[PDB]
Amino acid sequence: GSHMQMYKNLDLLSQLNERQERIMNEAKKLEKDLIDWTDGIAREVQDIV
C-alpha cells in the first residue's frame, strides 16, 4: 500500500548515490590528471630551457 510505495521511492536513492560516487570519482581523476599534466609539462620545459 502507501508504505511500499514510500519504500520504493526511498530506494531510488541507490541510483542517485551511484551517480554521486561516479561524479566524485571523475572529479578525483580529473584532479590527478591535471596535477600529473602540470608536473609532466614542467619537467619537459625544464628539460628544454
Residue numbers in the entry: 1 to 49
Task: Recite the paper's sentences.
In this process, small GTPase Rab5 functions as a master regulator of the early endosomal biogenesis. Rabex-5 is a specific GEF for Rab5, Rab17, and Rab21. Rabaptin-5 is a key effector of Rab5 and plays an important role in both homotypic and heterotypic fusions of early endosomes. The GEF activity of Rabex-5 is autoinhibited by its CC domain and is activated by the binding of Rabaptin-5 via its C2-1 domain.
In the Rabex-5CC structure, Rabex-5CC also forms a long α-helix (about 65 Å) and the four Rabex-5CC in the asymmetric unit form a tight four-helix bundle via the nonpolar surface. Rabex-5CC forms a stable amphipathic α-helix that tends to bury its nonpolar surface via oligomerization or interaction with the C-terminal regions of Rabaptin-5C212. The nonpolar surface of Rabex-5CC has good chemical and geometrical complementarities with the nonpolar surface groove of the GEF domain and thus might be able to bind there to block the substrate binding and hence autoinhibit the GEF activity as proposed by Delprato and Lambright (2007). Nonetheless, our structural and biochemical data show that although Rabex-5CC alone exists as a stable helix in both solution and crystal structure, it cannot form a stable complex with the GEF domain as shown by both GST pull-down assay and ITC analysis (data not shown).
